Amino acid sequence: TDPRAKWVPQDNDIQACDYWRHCSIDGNICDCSGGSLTNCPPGTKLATASWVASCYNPTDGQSYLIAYRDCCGYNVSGRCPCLNTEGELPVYRPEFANDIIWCFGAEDDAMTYHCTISPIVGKAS
Template sequence: MSQSDAFSRHKARSEKEDTGRRLLDRAVERLTRHVASRSSRRSLLGRAGAWVTFGALVPTLPVERASAATPAKPQPAKFKAPTPFAANAQTKDPTACNYWRYCAIDGFLCASCGGGVHSCPPGTSPSPTSWIGTCFNPGDGQSYLVAYRDCCGQDACSQPMCLGSEGDQPSYRPQANNDIIWCFGTGALIYNCSTSVIVGNAS
């Protein structure tokens, strides 16, 4: 290829590019003149200001935002009570007879007599043996094996007596009989109150 051919090709290419640029320049010029002839500077500034104001107001529009929504409080699960005592049982107040652990208790509550749900009052000692019951906890829907121990060594507590008879068996089945005074083996057969200790899950 000669030098003159290369030069003529280069010239033709640059003329095409110039033609394309001229066409684009003319189109932009026509559009600008058309807009300028139909609107004033004041209206252009007014429209630009309106768009800026609208853009600033968009975030304040009322829309549902997932981050701002407060989650609904979960409702406590309702479990079907297996027994009449469990239907009225509660989990908050251990000094009331309908506390869920007291389904098979018979006596005064140590929680009302200076002790706790599972601890004897000062000056008394727990019996080495106990009777058992299976109580339903309405808080978690589980049934638990509960051991009841008498606290012995002082006169009976003068608080109201509670009688839970779930699973109560005759005296010839002493492990499930709540009428027996369980103070033998403590050195004093004087009954004071009863505790309830969770042994484990009954299921």
């Protein structure tokens, strides 16, 4: 509710902006437009590019690396608009930046932003 308050992760609702894996998500939660937590809605294209954040998981007290990926080729869904910035560095550190439309490598050269997925790729170290 308080936009400026420290981000409080939770592992009990992914369509919520405070879901632990969305700790550096920008745009829209794919789950809310026909995708899932780690998959793209139909018709869109899965970008091969990604950015990372270390998100704390309060279920197991371990921080995990979320290599976010965009689903592209569609107008923005307009459902579950979210903007979090845990460990989010500026554009010049692109691998931690999230204003970028990370749609690169997407099939059929799709570069419009629809939504973003939050898959784990490792642990914090």
